[PDB]
Structure formats: structure tokens, C-alpha cells
Amino acid sequence: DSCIQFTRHASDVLLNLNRLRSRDILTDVVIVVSREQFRAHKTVLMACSGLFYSIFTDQLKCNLSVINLDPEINPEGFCILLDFMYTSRLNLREGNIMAVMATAMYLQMEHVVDTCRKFIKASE
Amino acid sequence: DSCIQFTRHASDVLLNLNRLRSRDILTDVVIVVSREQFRAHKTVLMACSGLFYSIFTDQLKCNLSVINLDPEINPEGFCILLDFMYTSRLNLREGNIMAVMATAMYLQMEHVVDTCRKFIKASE
């Protein structure tokens, strides 16, 4: 086509989706990670995670308002990944890298798994 | 903070949101523009438009499944802007620029209004 493209559009959209999440506007699901609860938008979770994409395209699970993750999932690791979904920024630290990588593998977020593998390899 | 950033994350999210729109997955509103109907995600519309942001934060309109636009709104102009919301690409042509700019003013999409004003000014 002969379209023009606004360079910052995708980033501006994601910024506003994070603002709606922070104000709890039109969030339609709560992700339960052991004792912790995280409110989010199903569409954003699906757009970021192979696991959520599979869950919310399922003809019964698409209608659930609560999703319980595997008890081995670390709440902080999930929190870091949810923040990444809504901002493109990943808070990867020596103290959390193992939990972040395991959570990213479970959530099927391949680019996160990739940077975790590389950061771990450099420390070996 | 000490976060790392994935450059293509925002674009990849928007691409997946457009794929969900194309397959009509978790769309929660229909925008009626005279004889034409457009299915979308309220969160994406709010993230792109000052008008939709105002509509869907309203305590009664937030729950509507159908929104009727002003009868002066051109369906093609709306279609072009909805495609832009979900892709960052604007199909701006001599034959549609007036309808696109008027629709962008109504929808409160200031960056679109700006490029339309500039493209019109260059032709004068």
C-alpha cells in the first residue's frame, strides 16, 4: 500500500493500556498466583503470552473471570512479567532471574526466555 | 530503574491485537457509522481516541455493547482510522483526506489531525 506510519503509535497505545490497568479500567480477569491476585486485560495477556493465548481462545475458559496458575509459579516473577507485558520493560536482576525465566517458560514468552538464558550464560 | 527494554514489544502487541480483531476474538463493542458496523476492543479504542476514552470511562456508557456515531461521520473515514488504531498505518489519499481529518477531529486523534492539516497545506 501507500500508507504513512506514526512511529510512536504502538508505544503510545501500550502506555495507555498500562494506564487503564493501573486505574483498573475495563480489566476483565484476575490471575491468581498462590496468595496473590493480579488484575489484567485478557487481550493484552493473549497478545504477550502463548499460554494466555491458548487459555482465552478456549470456548469455556474464554468466559472465566478468574485463572489460577500452577502453584510452582512465583508471584514476584509473574508481577515482573505482567509489568513487562504492559511496558516492554523487564526488571531482570540476579535475585529474580531464575523465577522470571521459569515463569516466562510457563507463560510461553519466548523473547524473555531468550534474554534470561543469555544473562545466565554470561554469569557461568 | 535498571530494566532492560525489548524494542519490538509494543509493535508485536499491537500486531496480535489486530489479529484478535480480524478473527473477532474478545471484541466487546460494535461501532455503528450510519449503515456500517465495526467490531472492536473498547480498550484499544480508548487507547487511541480521546472520544472513546471519554465514552468508555462513563459509568453508564462503559457497559454498552453498541455505540452510534454522529450521522455526519463517513464510514470509510472511520474504517481507515480504525485500521490505523490497530496497525500504526494510515491510508491517507487525496480522495479521502477530508473525511479522514473530519473523523480524526471527531474521534480526538490529534496526531492524525496534525498530519492531515500538513498534507492539505502542502497541496494549497
Partner: peptide, 4 residues
């Protein structure tokens, strides 16, 4: 705005 750019030519993509």
C-alpha cells in the same frame, strides 16, 4: 510520521 514516516514512509514504512
Amino acid at each position: 510520521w514516516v514512509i514504512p
